[PDB]
């Protein structure tokens, strides 16, 4: 599985693959691996389906509480550090999930990448996450311009995952894209995204 | 002396517990808040007149977000309000965690009624000396009042605090649930003036609302509230001549 | 009740009227209410 | 004085508990509730009269589904009820977890009685000052009244609350154990009319039941209520002319 | 050990295998693995027998009590999250059953899958779960219009579970088909289900 | 009163908790402290005055740094104050652990108001007999007063202590909202001068502040104090001849 | 004043807590202890006065060792002192465990005083009715009074106990910052001789001190206390012709 | 004065914990236990006269073993003596457990004082009403008086109980530090003789002693007691002729 | 993965290689593996990014708490010992890591090697640590002078780790040097360094 993130100057665009494939197992027709944390904030996860879904529900609810508490929406940073801490607390249950928590705040746009031992790090650039990551970086970094919008990011995020699929037996379809263009928190869904890759094939 | 109120566990000979009825008075001496429900949504309006000019105008806060679609406002010790409103957002959110559904107005109202009642039953810790307004739209607009004891009462419209009584008399005659969103806003503003025996200023009130046709929380902004205040001022002034 | 009435009547003399009124009564009650266990005061601070 | 009475952990020289004796009387200060049992089910009537018109006509609620085949009425303070019904419901649904079977109307009502008996022994807590009528069909109809002392009495028809004294007297002469469902139901509404001393409107009283051809909780809406209320109102008028 | 679920126009229909055999041990030939949680809600289990019933009994108890306290029927989403929370919280008392909670409620129609490791994902209108899951997806999707009736859905439901049991050699022969037409809760049960598939000659 | 003032678990017939009103008198036992809020930074002036001339004036401060842009002053007990700000230190730090973000002044006030509130509710513990003035800058300057009870009031200009009364009176008349930090610094020393009733010397005051372009707490050393105090000393004389 | 001195969680109406006020009367009741802070050190002298020869030469003890550079001495309830000082010892060591830095007096005083404060707060525990004067050289010399209310005070010269009043007056004249280590220590004996109003021998005073130039605690032998006694005695004699 | 001597939490104006000191009058009423030290060891003699000749007057007893060089006699309740002396025994072997060295007389004395003080300082649990004298030779003779309070005073020779008043006056006159094992043993018998005003016999007395020369606790059998008894007896009569 | 450290005479220098990889996801390649403990106090970790950063937040926070509470900036030893005791607590799961904590303090300059399972020991002027330690002693010691400046220490810190890199097999390209001369807290970062090392490798 693989989830990509890139920081544009016009927003945050990340993408996921809904099918989660063990090796020959279609597990789910569809599955949320994209959790809407806010209209500005996202968690896009690569890893186990069941443990990731449990943890996302925690953060989403306490993201909102922290929004209510201050009268003032999270920072992208503040949720991410919450996930590193909640993972290390709960490392006595065996949850392995790698996350991309990203979004838009008063400071600007940023993504924080999380491993299931902890850590949250700042990236203003290209970040890709999962076992398809090694491939993903090759595609994403070259064609990264700092002039890149969210308009040209959606073709790029599709293309990263897409390559990955054709060298991994554990990468599913149902290629989803989430776009956070700072006006909306949009989910393209499978259908639209599938024509974008129809122009990277035939 | 009495001794029916040297503890809440000591019941009065009169078939009552006076210590929790003094806990009612505690609300009263605090400043007003009114909830007005119409069938186009529910409104919640509360005092911000309190305090001199040494103070900052933004007096934080009577008008609390709890959910993004549920608001609560208070009267009483706002010491006793502050921990309960944090507890209210945690408890509300726990419903949200564990079912992935928005908490319903009624069920929230009951949970906060229950939370006061831990403190009422126990004697290791006193009853809170605060009253609560819970207003929201789950999908059906609802308005409730929580008593200091933790009693549950459904209202068409309610007030608590110093203005509890003027608002009661005003609305007994005139109010109707079949009124407009526009009428409902201005009409409880008229009622709010009488209680502080002054003319409204928009800086003297913080007003939030829950809409039925949004199904979301928004807090009203001073100058966006301003026409509602002007139109109210004709009635408020008139009714205090007499 | 008789002392509240006389006090009311005295309150009128102070406003230079013989017209007895609810406002004269209100001051007159208060004299009696002052004595006994007084419900007046306070608003917060902390009770607001 | 009189007592010996500022504690629940102190036996008074009269061989009672004062604190508890006073707490049975707090039930009387709150509203009435009327229970009537027949050989066709058990009907439960609960006073939903409160306030004037500023309140919602329906005030929650005051007749709770406790289990699927058990309902309970409340009398006394709203606050005490709120929490008391929570544990009864959980304990009933626990019986279905541990045996997978109905819970007896009798055995449930005992465990309601146990919860208030725990708060009668320990001096750090008070018992609830509230009495529920426990009406249901275990597999036969049964009526019990739970007391804030932890007391249990099987009745056949009863009242508790304000109308306690009045409606016992009414039922000495009138109650007959061969009444039809409709007759018993109507007789209970006459008993509420006596209590309030006024003609009943079906919009300000709440009625629920369990029959023995159904054995599941149902509720009589105010539109359904009309004929019953009219049939009650003839006799209530006859009482209120003497 | 497999379960299927599809969302009708007019109801929701789901199916179970009803005789669950492992090695040469058969628990009963009327061992229950079909659960009624509420009036127009059902739950269908794949995975272990013993953990299926014990878990289910507690969820009926939650269903009732939540209805009484909120005074509104509980949602399919509410109990799908509820079950997940329970599974993640009890890993020291772990249950090894893959749930499918589905039905009709106020929200509309939807079918959630719950993993034996917890966590609740939603499928638009088709879902298959279990050992039999890979064939069972293709049987359903051949005739699936969102405008399939209940009468054809219960027909469709059988052909997926019937294919699965014969392919494996240690599965038994029993099937339950459940229809929930929004007005009726019918349990067709092994005899009636059997003759539905007797029209195939074998 | 009459035993309705001698516990913390009693309301009086007035609905006033008197124990708490007494805890506020504790604040009033302690010495003068002033905070000023301006739109360019926040200003904090503490009395540094020594009881005798043989008490060292170095640790007898009220001004304690609590975060990188948050300081605070105290009146009340020293004893209560020191533990009470140490808790707020841990809170502020922990916020930075779980969010890596310096706590908001508003958020810090809410947490430590709720800290105090449990000490108020419980009967086996007193509330802290302290008020704080929490002054910091998070986006823009904020100024708060915490009550001993746990109430939260936002202010723009305030004092606590014995000198409280006089200082409000001064800031009613003199105070302006368009004064700069430098100018308002001068005004706050005349207000402190008023309250202690002498021309100040740097060795009997301690000033700390937070400006917005620093986004840090800095502390005003006695060297850095002198020119502001001299400007102020001039006007202080005129009021000791009034 | 009664009913505000019967509990430690009851404030009097002045805002004074008389429970705590009475705990300074404990201090004044017990043995004198005088501390002198100097530029060259810090000398702490505590009464070793015996009223009979039946009492052993050394009564355990008037100057406790806390660290090998930190000592403190006692006035008050000597019973109480034992638990208080065991704890004092333990904290100073504990800080060397977890930071491996000698504890500074400011923070040690804070931690001990927080430990007091906890028993002022709770209704279940009465606070230490004993005072210690904690002395040490870390970076520069320090002298503190840790109070039974949990207040730290840094002084230039101090005294506590029964001799408290005389020596506050004494050092008001005599503490000057031109004092040497030997001329400071003579002064602690003279201060001590005015309090008890008699001449000295080495065995009715117990002196230890902490010297800068070692950064280590030493406990002064009777042999080399004899010379300094003689120099003090002269002074004392003149003071006793008044 | 009163009203500050019925609780353990309360301080008097005097600053005296009077509840702890009535636990010292509980000590005072019954009965002489005497310690007398020398440089040859320490000798512990205690009364064993209580009631008629139906009470076997050879056992029950004050002279409990604490260690193989430590022994204690008691005065005060018999009940407190049993537990407190068990704690002191357990603490002697805890030193052996954890340091595998003979417990020092000082360390033991400090621990068991701290133990009594903990129950003094904690409200809601009374002060132990018993006193010990702790006698031992570590390598150096020590004789200590350990108080109900939880305080520590060291002596050269002393007594607690009924005889306390008498034997102090005696030791004021009589005591020199130049006594032997035998001269101390007999001088303590003469002290104890005036306190009960009678000729002592081996039946009504008990002696344990700890020698420097062997550092065994030895328990003196009546046979061994008897040579000394003849020697103290001529004195005892003569001074009851004076 | 190797870290070095040296006290100059007038500053303290530490350096850290940025290459952490776990699976086919590279955790850090241009994202920090160096944390700010206080104004002139630093900590470098040799070890995994998850472990390192969760620990580092803890030690950073209590560092701040030290400066406030006692009104005294923290010494190298305050942080050092504290980190050890804390490492002793948690041992239930991987929390074994090779840490260097240094910078400037008022008693002078220090660097302390903190052993994995507790312990803090001090090192005069040269430390290493890491798996490249053997190589590092040769480079660092040969070119150490005790009157070594800052200039030639930032230069030397790059040379020890990068010659070590080759001999190591989980080390690679990307390197951070940190300088604390008591006038800067500078993080040189990869880009700037690759240009200084353009002179001492080519």
Swiss-Prot record, chains A, E, I:
UniProt KW Protein biosynthesis keyword: no
GO biological process: proteasomal protein catabolic process
Gene3D superfamilies, per database record: Glutamine Phosphoribosylpyrophosphate, subunit 1, domain 1
Main localization, broad class: cytoplasm
SUPFAM superfamilies: N-terminal nucleophile aminohydrolases (Ntn hydrolases)
Enzyme class (EC, first level): hydrolase
Compartments, as annotated in UniProt: Cytoplasm
Catalytic residues of the enzyme: 1
EC number in record: 3.4.25.1
Annotated disulfide bonds: none
Chemical reaction(s) catalysed: Cleavage of peptide bonds with very broad specificity
Record carries keyword Membrane: no
Ways its activity is controlled: The formation of the proteasomal ATPase PAN-20S proteasome complex, via the docking of the C-termini of PAN into the intersubunit pockets in the alpha-rings, triggers opening of the gate for substrate entry. Interconversion between the open-gate and close-gate conformations leads to a dynamic regulation of the 20S proteasome proteolysis activity.
GO cellular component: cytoplasm; proteasome core complex, beta-subunit complex
MF (Gene Ontology): threonine-type endopeptidase activity
Keywords: Autocatalytic cleavage, Cytoplasm, Hydrolase, Protease, Proteasome, Threonine protease, Zymogen
Pfam families hit by this protein: Proteasome (PF00227)
Family stated for the protein in its record: Belongs to the peptidase T1B family.
Subunit: The 20S proteasome core is composed of 14 alpha and 14 beta subunits that assemble into four stacked heptameric rings, resulting in a barrel-shaped structure. The two inner rings, each composed of seven catalytic beta subunits, are sandwiched by two outer rings, each composed of seven alpha subunits. The catalytic chamber with the active sites is on the inside of the barrel. Has probably a gated structure, the ends of the cylinder being occluded by the N-termini of the alpha-subunits. Is likely capped at one or both ends by the proteasome regulatory ATPase, PAN.
Role summary: Component of the proteasome core, a large protease complex with broad specificity involved in protein degradation.
Protein name listed in UniProt: Proteasome subunit beta
Species the sequence originates in: Archaeoglobus fulgidus (strain ATCC 49558 / DSM 4304 / JCM 9628 / NBRC 100126 / VC-16)
Swiss-Prot record, chains B, D, F, G, H:
UniProt keyword Cytoplasm present: yes
InterPro entries (alphabetical): Ntn_hydrolases_N, Proteasome_alpha, Proteasome_alpha-type, Proteasome_asu_arc, Proteasome_asu_N, Proteasome_sua/b
Primary location class: cytoplasm
Single Gene Ontology MF annotation: threonine-type endopeptidase activity
PROSITE patterns for the chain: PROTEASOME_ALPHA_1, PROTEASOME_ALPHA_2
Regulation: The formation of the proteasomal ATPase PAN-20S proteasome complex, via the docking of the C-termini of PAN into the intersubunit pockets in the alpha-rings, triggers opening of the gate for substrate entry. Interconversion between the open-gate and close-gate conformations leads to a dynamic regulation of the 20S proteasome proteolysis activity.
Location of the protein in the cell: Cytoplasm
Keyword Cytoplasm in annotation: yes
SUPFAM superfamilies referenced in this protein's UniProt entry, alphabetically: N-terminal nucleophile aminohydrolases (Ntn hydrolases)
One Gene Ontology CC term in the entry: proteasome core complex, alpha-subunit complex
NCBIfam families the UniProt entry points to: arc_protsome_A (TIGR03633), PRK03996.1 (NF003075)
Subunit structure, interactors included: The 20S proteasome core is composed of 14 alpha and 14 beta subunits that assemble into four stacked heptameric rings, resulting in a barrel-shaped structure. The two inner rings, each composed of seven catalytic beta subunits, are sandwiched by two outer rings, each composed of seven alpha subunits. The catalytic chamber with the active sites is on the inside of the barrel. Has probably a gated structure, the ends of the cylinder being occluded by the N-termini of the alpha-subunits. Is likely capped at one or both ends by the proteasome regulatory ATPase, PAN.
Protein name (Swiss-Prot/TrEMBL): Proteasome subunit alpha
Gene: psmA
Curated annotation (Swiss-Prot), chain C:
Location of this chain's protein in the cell: Cytoplasm
Residues covered by region (Docks into pockets in the proteasome alpha-ring to cause gate opening): 46-48
Domain notes: Consists of three main regions, an N-terminal coiled-coil domain that may assist in substrate recognition, an interdomain involved in PAN hexamerization, and a C-terminal ATPase domain of the AAA type.
Subunit structure: Homohexamer. The hexameric complex has a two-ring architecture resembling a top hat that caps the 20S proteasome core at one or both ends. Upon ATP-binding, the C-terminus of PAN interacts with the alpha-rings of the proteasome core by binding to the intersubunit pockets.
Function noted in UniProt: ATPase which is responsible for recognizing, binding, unfolding and translocation of substrate proteins into the archaeal 20S proteasome core particle. Is essential for opening the gate of the 20S proteasome via an interaction with its C-terminus, thereby allowing substrate entry and access to the site of proteolysis. Thus, the C-termini of the proteasomal ATPase function like a 'key in a lock' to induce gate opening and therefore regulate proteolysis.
Family under the similarity heading: Belongs to the AAA ATPase family.
Protein known as: Proteasome-activating nucleotidase
Gene name of this polypeptide: pan
